[PDB]
């Protein structure tokens, strides 16, 4: 029987895990958190508490603050049609606005093997993302 079932089931079997951690880190949260709040925390943890593009520290206490951090695509949907979780990163709003509709390779001048590109690659490679996601974010 039909990757979708495994996706839907394993994706089921990843949200209780992330919901359980959200309760741990926000035990005074008011109401029920939504999926975006849950996923922000998951990406926070995989990124070692840092904004992927800038390397700046994300204040966990401000994780759910309006305008502070956003989930966005690393590779623009307009150019890839990639709406997958492997294409989603947690970034400071201001840094994401600077990147705009560029890929990371473009934004960081990877074509010239710049120091900023090397630094970004090192942050991606030292994250807890799976290999498929590290590969996706760094696509040239």
């Amino acid at each position: 029987a039909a990757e979708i079932e495994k996706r839907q089931e394993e994706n089921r079997k990843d949200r209780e895990k992330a919901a359980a951690k959200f309760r741990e880190y926000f035990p005074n949260f008011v109401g029920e958190p939504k999926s975006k709040d849950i996923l922000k925390l998951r990406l926070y943890e995989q990124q070692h508490g840092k904004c992927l593009y800038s390397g700046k520290e994300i204040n966990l206490g401000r994780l759910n603050e309006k305008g502070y951090v956003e989930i966005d695509h690393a590779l623009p949907f307009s150019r890839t049609w990639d709406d997958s979780f492997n294409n989603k990163v947690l970034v400071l709003g201001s840094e994401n606005q600077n990147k705009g509709n560029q890929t990371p390779y473009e934004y960081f001048n990877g074509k010239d093997n710049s120091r900023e590109w090397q630094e970004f690659k090192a942050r991606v490679e030292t994250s807890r993302f799976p290999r498929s996601k590290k590969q996706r974010i760094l696509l040239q």
Partner: protein, 85 residues
């Protein structure tokens, strides 16, 4: 076609996600995310989700309000661009 438009700085951008956009002078001047219009949308912002959710009464009402002032379409917000779907 899947025309793409820059999202303006006062449009309500909130990162990637399925949204309605009002398009004026080649720019998305207002976006409204599906996850905000429909609190029970707990999907993962996949492009194909609009086939199910495009007919929700709250989406229809939100789109009608935007159409009062500008061309309005369903699509995807991503990297500060709106892609019509």
């Amino acid at each position: 076609a899947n025309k793409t438009y820059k999202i303006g700085k006062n449009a309500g951008y909130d990162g990637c996600g399925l949204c309605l956009a009002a398009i004026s002078e080649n720019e998305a001047i207002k976006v409204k995310y599906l996850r905000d219009i429909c609190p029970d949308y707990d999907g993962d912002d996949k492009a194909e989700d609009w086939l199910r959710w495009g007919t929700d009464s709250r989406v229809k009402a939100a789109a009608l309000e935007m159409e009062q002032y500008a061309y309005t379409s369903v699509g995807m917000a991503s990297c500060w661009e709106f892609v019509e779907l």
